[PDB]
Structure formats: C-alpha cells, structure tokens
Amino acid sequence: DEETLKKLIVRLNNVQEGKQIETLVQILEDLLVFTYSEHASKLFQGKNIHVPLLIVLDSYMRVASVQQVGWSLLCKLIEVCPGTMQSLMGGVHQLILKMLTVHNASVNLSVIGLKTLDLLLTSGKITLLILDEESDIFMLIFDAMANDEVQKLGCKALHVLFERVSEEQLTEFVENKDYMILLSALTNFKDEEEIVLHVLHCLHSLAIPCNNVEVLMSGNVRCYNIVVEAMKAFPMSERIQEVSCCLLHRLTLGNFFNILVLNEVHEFVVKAVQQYPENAALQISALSCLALLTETIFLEDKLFWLEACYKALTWHRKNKHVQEAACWALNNLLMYQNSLHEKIGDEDGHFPAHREVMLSMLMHSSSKEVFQASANALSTLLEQNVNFRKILLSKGIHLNVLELMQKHIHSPEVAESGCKMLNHLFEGSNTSLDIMAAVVPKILTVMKRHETSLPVQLEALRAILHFIVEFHHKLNM
Amino acid sequence: DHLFKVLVVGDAAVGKTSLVQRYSQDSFSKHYKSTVGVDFALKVLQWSDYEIVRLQLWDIAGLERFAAMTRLYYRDASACVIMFDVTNATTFSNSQRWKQDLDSKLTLPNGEPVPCLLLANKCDLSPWAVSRDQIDRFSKENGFTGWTETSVKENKNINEAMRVLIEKMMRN
Ligand SMILES: Nc1nc2c(ncn2[C@@H]2O[C@H](COP(=O)(O)OP(=O)(O)NP(=O)(O)O)[C@H](O)[C@H]2O)c(=O)[nH]1
Ligand SMILES: [Mg+2]
C-alpha cells in the first residue's frame, strides 16, 4: 500500500533515466486514480512528488512522455487532494505557461495543459500571477485556436482573464481578438451549450468599454448572433438567456434604432421574462433594456409586460434593483400607452400594481433611485386615470412622501419627482386646513433647499398653485 | 403633530381587514375575503389640542406564514398588534409564532420591545367566546402591553382598545 507509494516517490527523486522515470510516473498515475481510499491524499502534499517532474519537463522539453503524463498526474492530484490549491499558493504558473509556449503545439499536449489551467484558475488569487507573466498568456490562448475540447476549454478560461485585462486591453483585443472567438467558435460549436455560454459571457466581459459598441455594431454581428443563439440554441436554458439578456442590457445606447432587430430582441426579451421569473438572473436586465427599447419601438405585448412587471415586484420585494427596474419599465410603458389605464387597478382581472409600488417605496426609503422611478411611475398612473385620485390620498401617501423628502434632501431629482407627484395627485381636489398646514410648509422648505434647479421650482410652484385655493378663525392662523 | 406606523398581524381568514376597515373606513362585518398582499389605511386622531396624530395601518397578509417574515415591514415601524380568531387553537399557536417572530426581528431606538396587544376577534360567536381565563395565561406569560376582547362585525370594543394601545404607544 503506502510502502509502494513511498518507494515510487523516493525513486522519483533520483532523476536518473528519463524513460524509467516516465514509466514510474505513468504507473503512479494509474494507481492513484481510484476510489479505494485517500492514500494518495496522505496529507503530505510534498512538492518533491511533482516539482522535479515539472522541472524535468521544462528543462528537457523534447521529452514528450513527462509532458503527456505529468500534467495528467497533477490534474488527478488536484482533483483528489483537497488542499492542493492551498499548496499551490501560500512559480507553477510560469512553468505551465512555458509548457504551453515552447512545445505545446500538439493537440494532445495542448488539451491537458488548457484543462489544468482551467481547473487551476477556479482557485483564485493566481490569476494576477498568470496575467503578470512573460509568456504572453493572451497571445498563447489566441494562438491555441481547432478541436471541440480545446474550444470549450479555451472558453471557461479567458472568461476569467477578461476580469482585469484593462479597458484598454479589451480595446486592443477588440481589433483582432473578437474574430479568434466569435468567428472561431460561435459558428464552429453552434451545437455546444457550454461553449456558447462561455463565448457569450466573454462577449459580455469584452463589451465593458463604451467605444467598442461601434466595433460590436460594425455589421450588426453581435445582435444577430445573440438573437440566433437565444432563439435556437437555448429554448429552455436559464443561463444562456440570462447572459444574452445582460448583453442586451449593456448594448443599449444612442444607436438603439435597430428597428427590425429592435422588434426581434423585444420579442426575445418577452420570451425570457415569461419563461424564468424566479431570480434577478433575467428580470432586472430585461426590464431596464425593455423599458428603453419599448420607448423607442412604440413611436397584447403591453398586457404581458404588465403581468411580468407585477410578478417582478411580487417575487423580488427584497432587492432594491429589481423593483427599481420593474417600476421604471412600468412607467416607461405607461407613458407611451395610455389605453391600459383601466386595465390596471384593484379590481379583478387587473394587476394591483399600485399597492405594490407604494410598498416598494416604503420598504426602500434609503435609496433615491427606487423612489425616483416608482414616484414617476405612480405619478404617470395618477395622471392617466382620475379614479385613483383620493384613494392613495386616503391610503397615506401625502404626509408619507413629505417625510421621505424630509429624509432625502441632498438631491434635486428626488425633490422634483416628489413635487411632480404631488402636483398630479392633488389636481382636481379640495383639501382642508389641516392638510394645508401639513403640506405647504414642507414643500416650501424643500423648494428653499433647492432654489437653483429650475424643474424643482416649476413643479413646486405648480403644486402650490393647485393646492392653495369658526372656519375663518382657523384659516387666518 | 406626529405620524406613526402600526402593523396588524395574525392568522389567515380571521378578518384582519375587517378591523382596519371598521376603524378607518367605517366598514364592519361584510363579506369574508382573502388578503393577497399588504394593504394600507390612514387614521387621524385629535388626541390633544394642537396635537393631531396620524396612523398608518399595515395589515400584513398571513397566508405566507411559512415564508420568511421580512424585517422590511417591521422596519421603521412604531407599533404592532396581533389579532387572532377565537375559534381555533391553531390561531393561538400562530399568534405565539408572530410574537416570537416580532421579538426576534423588531428593534426600537430605546431598545425596549414595542407595545403589543392581544386582540380576541369576533367574540360575538359561539362557543369559545369569553374564555378569558385561558387567555390570561398567555396574557401574563408573554408580557404583552394589553389584551382585550373584540368583535369586528359589532365593533363592540375596537375603539377603546385602539385608544388604550395608542395612549400606551405615545406613553413611551
Ligand atoms: N362569524 C363572524 N364572521 C364575521 C364577523 N364579522 C365579520 N365576519 C366575517 O369574517 C370575514 C373576514 O374576511 P376578511 O376581512 O376579508 O379576512 P382577512 O383576514 O382580511 N383575509 P387575510 O387573512 O388574508 O388578511 C368578513 O369580515 C365577514 O364575512 C362576526 O362578527 N362573526
Ligand atoms: Mg385581511
């Protein structure tokens, strides 16, 4: 048992004959891959088992045997020994990059090296060492790409290398790297779900710089490939749809007038939010993307959007971002489509999105963005349908938002949205003296605190205008 | 003037809205319905001269009792109340669960527990109606601020109990 392993590792330190050491390493690798016990993981974790092997492989590069089986041996050891990654750091990256550099031009030698690199990069804190080497790891992997395992491992790798290459590094990459992947694999492995996932999220990672959108939209290649992947590759895959959706969200800008493609992606977005409504995975990205694209497109679907937004609020009350994006989408939809004003409400067959929006506002007072979006949404809703007036008033909205603007005062946008919402809420109604005393001083103080901002002044003046006009004695006070 | 928030919690189908409609919308009895989500009501009380208080009643839906009772509802809240129907001991165990949950996930600026009141709903129904002797055990064991019988349809003691609870709340 362990006595034979001790003899093998002792003989491994001799480094006498390359062929004999190769056969011994092969025998040790064959014996180590078993489910009998953790004898190979005897907690020693001695580098003397594998450091001389990699030293021999690097120095004697012509020895293909040690290259072929030493990588498999270390892969098996890492997959078996739990603390092998802990033994890696606290180097080996330089050794593996030299292995990939000098003589890994063969398919068999390349695939094992890329697999070992992929499993090593799952540990963390070693990517910085990999990116600060001298072997040009990005150039190495670019030169590596044409076999399926190579590709599925070319990606699942790179995926982490794009985390901090540099916005500039991505910019250098956009010139030539896109072809070595998008052209190289999306077409080639059109039938490889994991490869498609890795390629799509690598596109996500490289899409961070703003200048590269024009490069990505050179011939609408990004939009077409992602739409085709969403349509065909993944009818019922959550990860693919989520990644493609995040690409959609990050690829919305002043060039949004991709009319036909607009319609296409809009449909795909609907499909996404209708087929996986259980996590932030799709909801936030799609709703924000959808809101902008719906504004552009509108210049049925609206009912589906209302339902999707209602479940978005319902199932993710704890996340500020989800609610913000969903209520913003509801606002932007209701702005361009007013026919559904009666289609929403407390009555049966209509989504009660009012109480949900109010609950969102109360439960996330600390964020100005959620207040801004939800306030604009329910203000537009109140302007659309007159029936909702005096119902929220009876529900406790006025003094509540007054206290909220009292809490949030350092920003002008929040004050402007609050004043606009008060204007559209209190229109066409008559209040009492108590409401006057509870409303006018607070809004006057808010207007004083933000005197320079023109929209805040306009909205405040409009609200005061619509709101200003025994009993005589009280009114005098 | 001041504003405050009160959270009404309890078991399912106990007529939570009935009480909140009776105290604010002046709607009592009526049809028995299921509360899908959290609903709101406003109350204005002229407790003292030049001192008018506003109350926001949040009637938490008890259908998803097994679901995690998020602290966001109790966040910034100033008062709470547990109301259970008197025709089921399961409602009594549920009220104990609500008490434990609020004691675990509610905080005050002074750190003391916020006032709580045990509402014995619709006592105007046979047979377990005036079993105050059994209720007194939990009344003194749980350390509740108050306990009071009530009937949503008849509104026999909603007003006095609410006045006592709000007076206790401003007493802190
Ligand atoms: N037996 C009896 N039933 C009453 C009395 N008063 C009201 N009810 C009935 O009880 C019903 C309770 O329905 P509802 O208020 O909608 O229940 P809810 O508790 O708000 N639903 P949820 O638990 O989700 O909040 C209605 O109030 C009425 O039909 C009463 O004095 N006796
Ligand atoms: Mg109810």
Author numbering:
A (entry chain E): 12 to 101, 113 to 167, 172 to 325, 344 to 513, 525 to 532
B (entry chain B): 5 to 176
Task: Copy out sentences from the published article reporting this entry, exactly as the authors wrote them.
Mutations in the LRRK2 gene, which encodes the leucine-rich repeat kinase 2 (LRRK2) protein, are among the most frequent genetic causes of late-onset PD and account for ~5% of familial and ~1% of sporadic cases. Most LRRK2-related PD mutations, such as G2019S (Gly2019→Ser), have increased kinase activity. Previous studies have suggested an emerging “Rab29–LRRK2–Rabs” cascade for LRRK2 signaling, in which GTP-bound Rab29 (Rab29•GTP) facilitates LRRK2 membrane recruitment and activation, then activated LRRK2 phosphorylates Rab GTPases, including Rab29 itself.
We determined cryo–electron microscopy (cryo-EM) structures of the Rab29–LRRK2 complex, reconstituted by mixing LRRK2, Rab29EM, GTP analog (GppNHp), adenosine triphosphate (ATP), and Mg2+. We thus introduced three point mutations (Q67L, T71A, and S72A) to Rab29 (Rab29EM) to maximize the opportunity of capturing the active Rab29•GTP–LRRK2 complex (where Q is glutamine, L is leucine, T is threonine, A is alanine, and S is serine). T71A and S72A prevent Rab29 phosphorylation, and Q67L abolishes GTPase activity and enhances the interaction between Rab29 and LRRK2 (26). The interaction conforms with a general Rab-effector recognition mode, in which effectors associate with the GTP-bound form of Rabs through the Switch I-Interswitch-Switch II surface. The surfaces of Rab29 and Rab10 predicted to interact with LRRK2 had almost identical interface residues, which is consistent with previous work suggesting that Rab10 interacts with LRRK2 at the Rab29 site. We also assessed the effect of interface mutations on LRRK2 kinase activity in cells by monitoring the phosphorylation status of Rab10-Thr73, Rab29-Thr71, and LRRK2-Ser1292 (28). All mutations introduced to the Rab29–LRRK2 interface had minor impacts on the basal activity of LRRK2 on Rab10 and Ser1292, supporting the view that the observed interface is important for LRRK2 recruitment but probably not for substrate recognition.
